Amino acid sequence: SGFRKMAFPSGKVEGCMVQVTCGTTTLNGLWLDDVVYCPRHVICTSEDMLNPNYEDLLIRKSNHNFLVQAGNVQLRVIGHSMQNCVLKLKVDTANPKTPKYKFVRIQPGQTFSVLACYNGSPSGVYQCAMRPNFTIKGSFLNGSCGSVGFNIDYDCVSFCYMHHMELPTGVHAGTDLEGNFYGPFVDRQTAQAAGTDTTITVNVLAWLYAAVINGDRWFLNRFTTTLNDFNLVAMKYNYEPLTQDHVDILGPLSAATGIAVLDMCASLKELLQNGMNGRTILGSALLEDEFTPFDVVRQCSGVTFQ
Amino acid sequence: SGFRKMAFPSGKVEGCMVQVTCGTTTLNGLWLDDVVYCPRHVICTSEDMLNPNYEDLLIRKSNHNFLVQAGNVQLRVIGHSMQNCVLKLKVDTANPKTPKYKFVRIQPGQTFSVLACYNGSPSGVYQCAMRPNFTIKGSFLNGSCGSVGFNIDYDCVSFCYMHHMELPTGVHAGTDLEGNFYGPFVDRQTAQAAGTDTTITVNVLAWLYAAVINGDRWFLNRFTTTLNDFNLVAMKYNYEPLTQDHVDILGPLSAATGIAVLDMCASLKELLQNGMNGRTILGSALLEDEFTPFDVVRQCSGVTFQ
Ligand SMILES: [Cl-]
Ligand SMILES: [Cl-]
Ligand code: NA
Ligand code: NA
Numbered sequence: 001s002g003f004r005k006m007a008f009p010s011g012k013v014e015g016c017m018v019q020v021t022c023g024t025t026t027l028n029g030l031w032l033d034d035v036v037y038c039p040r041h042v043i044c045t046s047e048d049m050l051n052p053n054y055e056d057l058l059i060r061k062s063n064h065n066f067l068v069q070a071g072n073v074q075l076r077v078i079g080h081s082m083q084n085c086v087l088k089l090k091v092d093t094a095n096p097k098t099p100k101y102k103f104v105r106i107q108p109g110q111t112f113s114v115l116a117c118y119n120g121s122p123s124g125v126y127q128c129a130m131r132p133n134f135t136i137k138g139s140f141l142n143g144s145c146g147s148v149g150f151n152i153d154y155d156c157v158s159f160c161y162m163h164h165m166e167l168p169t170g171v172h173a174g175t176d177l178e179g180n181f182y183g184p185f186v187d188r189q190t191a192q193a194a195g196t197d198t199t200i201t202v203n204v205l206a207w208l209y210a211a212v213i214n215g216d217r218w219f220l221n222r223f224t225t226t227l228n229d230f231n232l233v234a235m236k237y238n239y240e241p242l243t244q245d246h247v248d249i250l251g252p253l254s255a256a257t258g259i260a261v262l263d264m265c266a267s268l269k270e271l272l273q274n275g276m277n278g279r280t281i282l283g284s285a286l287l288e289d290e291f292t293p294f295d296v297v298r299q300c301s302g303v304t305f306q
Numbered sequence: 307s308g309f310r311k312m313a314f315p316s317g318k319v320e321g322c323m324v325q326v327t328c329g330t331t332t333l334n335g336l337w338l339d340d341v342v343y344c345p346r347h348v349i350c351t352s353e354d355m356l357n358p359n360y361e362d363l364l365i366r367k368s369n370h371n372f373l374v375q376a377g378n379v380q381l382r383v384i385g386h387s388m389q390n391c392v393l394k395l396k397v398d399t400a401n402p403k404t405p406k407y408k409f410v411r412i413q414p415g416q417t418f419s420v421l422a423c424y425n426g427s428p429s430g431v432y433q434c435a436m437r438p439n440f441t442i443k444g445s446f447l448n449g450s451c452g453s454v455g456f457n458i459d460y461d462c463v464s465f466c467y468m469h470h471m472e473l474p475t476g477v478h479a480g481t482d483l484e485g486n487f488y489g490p491f492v493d494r495q496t497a498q499a500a501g502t503d504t505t506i507t508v509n510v511l512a513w514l515y516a517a518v519i520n521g522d523r524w525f526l527n528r529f530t531t532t533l534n535d536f537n538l539v540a541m542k543y544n545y546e547p548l549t550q551d552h553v554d555i556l557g558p559l560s561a562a563t564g565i566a567v568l569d570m571c572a573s574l575k576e577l578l579q580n581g582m583n584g585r586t587i588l589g590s591a592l593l594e595d596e597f598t599p600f601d602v603v604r605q606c607s608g609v610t611f612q
Contacts, residue, residue: 001476002445004311009421009428011317115315123609124312125431139308141608170307170520214476283443285591302447304427 003210003282006299007113007125008152015097018075019120020089020146021067028117028146029068029089030159032098036068036089037177038146039164040082041187049189058082069120084179085187086162100156103177108132109200109240111292112149112160116140129290132198132240134183138163138172152305167194200289201239202246205264207288209253210296211281218279220259223266230265237272249293309516309588312605313419314458316431321403324381325426326395326452327373334423334452335374335395336465338404342374342381342395343483344452345470346388347493355495364388375426390485391493392468406462409483414438415506417598418455418466422446435596438546439503440489441477442467460612473500506595507545508552511570513594515559516602517587524585526565529572536571543578555599
């Protein structure tokens with residue numbers, strides 16, 4: 001019993017983190033086989049960031065302009081290329097600790113573990129969700145660029161996020177490992193800002209199921225709702241509409257507790273319209289939306305990883 | 307920017323997790339150098355657990371009655387002993403992945419990361435605090451015994467907790483790595499219950515400083531209080547008394563933000579006596595007490611260079 005924000009074990013990713021230096025800039029890179037992936041803005045000076053011509057800036061660079069350090073060992077760069085917003089540095093050594101991996105672009109609402117790194121050295125791990133507005137509410141200090149987010153699937157480590165920048169409100173923007181930003185953000189100094197956000201309804205329901213699994217039941221009722229009527233209430237409270245796909249993904253938690261998804265929706269409708277009346281759920285006085293259905297399953301069933 | 311429940315990267319501990327089997331019982335062990343540490347209750351049947359004579363049970367077992375599996379490799383047990391509530395299995399191979407490490411005993415209010423494991427394999431990592439009543443509000447299922455809690459400082463893992471049991475309210479109890487329980491708990495099946503818990507005052511204050519750092523200021527006021535006057539209010543609200551040592555520990559955060567410790571106490575006194583009136587602090591409607599002052603500095607400022 002118990003329910004905590006729980007990250008995936010980070011060891012397989014820790015063994016892939018390196019330090020990348022170009023000119024006066026140092027950040028983090030991801031070393032998989034004989035390639036190091038990092039944000040392409042490592043090649044930019046402060047002046048360059050105003051309107052960087054990345055193709056021109058990269059043409060002027062050579063392999064020796066890039067320093068890669070894995071622990072206390074220098075890896076010599078023997079090639080460089082650019083894929084969207086990610087720099088790929090071919091190095092003289094394949095990472096002997098490379099896990100089975102894939103690059104996956106996640107959807108808004110889905111969570112991942114972030115391994116916050118500085119100077120190529122992992123410093124902490126925590127859970128984040130990709131918000132509907134395509135930002136993450138991370139915790140990152142100077143030097144954190146290139147830190148990565150990941151999940152572990154049944155097959156392998158699934159890298160989904162590379163950290164690029166902090167937005168004015170203190171939330172964070174980055175790319176997948178193919179270098180495509182989540183959301184409309186760009187790796188230039190512009191006026192860009194996060195748009196309005198929305199609460200991830202399927203995750204709130206998953207967390208209510210986690211609460212029932214853990215013995216918190218006061219919010220269950222005998223009321224019913226249709227999916228349409230629930231979604232109208234959800235929209236009033238700036239929750240995302242719940243799709244039938246989301247209902248289907250909640251199936252395993254519905255089965256584990258014996259509470260049909262639409263009955264949990266009737267509970268959530270009352271919570272949105274009436275609040276908690278001084279009660280708590282899993283120790284919280286607010287509804288939590290950064291656990292996915294699978295996050296609840298992996299924690300409440302004790303799934304383990306390679 | 308940002309503030310998250312942040313754990314230490316788990317890789318250095320993952321490399322030490324093994325599976326220990328005695329009879330029909332399997333749990334987790336910690337393999338450091340040529341010793342595997344695990345809860346001694348691994349030697350008990352359910353019937354033994356009612357009133358176990360551990361000395362007698364252990365003296366009648368031989369080395370070959372213990373199976374230790376590290377990944378797919380069987381380790382050979384060449385000796386065994388009991389130190390308080392921890393069993394120590396000497397094996398004929400030193401763990402090549404042994405990190406720099408220490409065994410430390412923590413105090414209530416201090417935090418650590420937990421690598422929850424099942425059958426010697428890692429499930430997830432989370433952060434928690436040792437409660438004033440010496441339990442931890444963990445996330446643990448059957449099979450998780452022998453999972454460890456730890457802090458990491460400059461590549462050195464300080465192990466502070468080994469998991470032994472879940473208590474009737476669903477909170478968790480365990481030992482230091484020398485086998486001494488935290489709190490009034492014993493490794494036998496008996497009616498034992500956690501005592502009444504209290505809130506970790508110094509940690510709430512630290513979190514309020516984290517909130518100021520992250521831009522929250524509404525709870526700051528023009529009021530003042532003495533340490534003795536504040537502690538009169540703290541006692542009324544089931545908060546631990548605040549000591550001058552706690553005030554000294556809060557020194558750096560106080561100087562960094564310009565908010566005297568006793569002025570933050572005045573803010574906390576107002577929060578306890580009046581509530582939040584519909585507002586939030588760091589996106590929470592309740593006061594958080596599982597971040598220490600050092601945890602706040604580590605996350606918002608970083609670790610100093612050695
Ligand atoms: Cl913004
Ligand atoms: Cl061995
Ligand atoms: Na809350
Ligand atoms: Na109890």
